[PDB]
């Protein structure tokens, strides 16, 4: 893959996103199901359904609050396996068609109980303030009920892993030790946090090249 | 034009047919459109069976006369049990949707008699679909005995006690998936011999 700066109309086809990991809150069954507890007499009283987390993706338009992109949803495996997918998905709007004003959004719909399946909400930005679309690169995010977002620290380290994809000056022995850095990214699994009312997800969308965007 | 866009294949139009089915109330015309959507559901059951799931889930919003077609819809649920796991969840959504408003007691009694037996799967959605059996039983004593025949819960009393029953019904489907792998392996094996003992 090659990095290069390529503007909106200059860039050709529609976007796609691969999505992989999350952060277990540990407050419930690992699928974020039913809010497990010894008080479960109340769980029978509250009729708490066991929800298997699934996901959905659609983009909030321009921050103009219109609707453009397509909602899309995938299949179901254990979310108690923390549903690590790296699964690609897409919709029908090109980069040439894509307005530099645009924003991603996602809703995690679990599968809970009678007429019941959960719903969680999040949103983010498509391209950079530097116009590069998510720097055409890997990322990680965090979201609460409303007004929450993503940062980069360990995700900044992961962004440096995306700088390995972003083609900083590189060599062949460096590549073998980048297999050793597959061992290092394997070691990166050590991460720990226990927040609430909010959650984290690891989502990589590294492309070949840095987009740029403009009008038609 | 609607039937044309629906027949077009560009699966995005099929998802666009959802809002069409939502606003279809203005059109009081025949079931021919639903038949075209049914053939579309078959052709989807051929290739785009994942999308067939999402379409069928939305297809439960029909809410139309001639309940005799709902039996073919149940057969379409049995056909939805084919492969896609999303089709199972969709069929569960249709199961709850049908659980809200019923049609025929006896046919749905035998239906649910098989379905609840097939609802013992440990899948997260399968449990949700299994929970609809109690809601079905709400709509008495003869049915209580008939259900007690296949009942897996000795201590069952009510809805909460049915929740405790499902809590005692906890099982692992991993070995069941491996058993399915053994079933496919048997399908790859030789079943030619019908001999016994």
């Amino acid at each position: 893959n090659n990095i290069t700066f390529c503007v909106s109309q200059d860039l050709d086809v529609p976007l796609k996103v691969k999505i992989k990991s999350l952060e277990g809150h540990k407050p419930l069954l690992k699928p974020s199901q039913k809010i497990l507890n010894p008080e479960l007499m109340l769980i029978g009283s509250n009729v708490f359904p066991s929800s298997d987390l699934i996901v959905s993706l659609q983009v909030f338009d321009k921050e103009r609050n219109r609707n453009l992109t397509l909602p899309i949803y995938t299949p179901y495996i254990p979310f108690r396996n923390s549903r690590t997918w790296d699964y690609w998905l897409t919709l029908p709007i090109r980069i040439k068609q894509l307005t530099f004003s645009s924003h991603l959004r996602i809703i995690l719909w679990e599968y809970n109980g009678s007429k019941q399946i959960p719903f969680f909400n999040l949103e983010t930005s498509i391209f950079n303030l530097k116009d590069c679309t998510l720097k055409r690169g890997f990322e990680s995010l965090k979201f609460r009920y409303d007004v929450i977002d993503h940062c980069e620290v360990v995700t900044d380290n992961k962004d440096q892993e995306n700088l390995n994809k972003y083609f900083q000056g590189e060599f062949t022995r460096l590549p073998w030790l980048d297999e050793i850095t597959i061992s290092k990214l394997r070691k990166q699994r050590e991460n720990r946090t226990w927040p609430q009312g909010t959650f984290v997800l690891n989502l990589e969308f590294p492309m070949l090249e840095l987009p740029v965007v403009f009008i038609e | 034009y609607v039937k044309m866009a629906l027949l077009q294949n560009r699966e995005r139009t099929n998802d666009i047919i959802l809002s069409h089915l939502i606003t279809y109330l203005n059109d009081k015309d025949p079931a021919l459109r639903v038949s075209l959507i049914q053939t579309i559901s078959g052709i989807s059951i051929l290739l785009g069976t994942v999308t067939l799931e999402q379409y069928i889930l939305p297809l439960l919003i029909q809410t139309i006369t001639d309940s005799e077609e709902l039996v073919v819809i149940s057969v379409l649920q049995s056909l939805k049990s084919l492969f896609k796991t999303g089709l199972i969840r969709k069929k569960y959504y249709i199961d709850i949707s049908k659980t809200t408003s019923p049609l025929l007691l006896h046919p749905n009694n035998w239906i649910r008699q098989f379905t609840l037996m097939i609802i013992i799967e440990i899948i997260n959605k399968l449990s949700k679909a299994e929970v609809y059996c109690i809601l079905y039983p709400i709509i008495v004593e003869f049915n209580f005995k008939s259900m007690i025949s296949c009942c897996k819960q000795p201590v069952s009393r009510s809805v909460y006690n049915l929740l405790c029953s499902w809590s005692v019904r906890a099982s692992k489907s991993l070995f069941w998936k491996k058993i399915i792998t053994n079933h496919v392996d048997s399908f790859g094996n030789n079943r030619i011999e019908f001999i016994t003992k």
Binding site: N1, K18, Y87, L208 | -
Partner: peptide, 18 residues
């Protein structure tokens, strides 16, 4: 003995194709 195992699913590419 037995031949190569049969997977129940296959991974998308999305990498070199990009």
């Amino acid at each position: 003995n037995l031949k190569n195992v049969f997977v129940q699913l296959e991974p998308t590419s999305y990498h070199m194709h990009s």
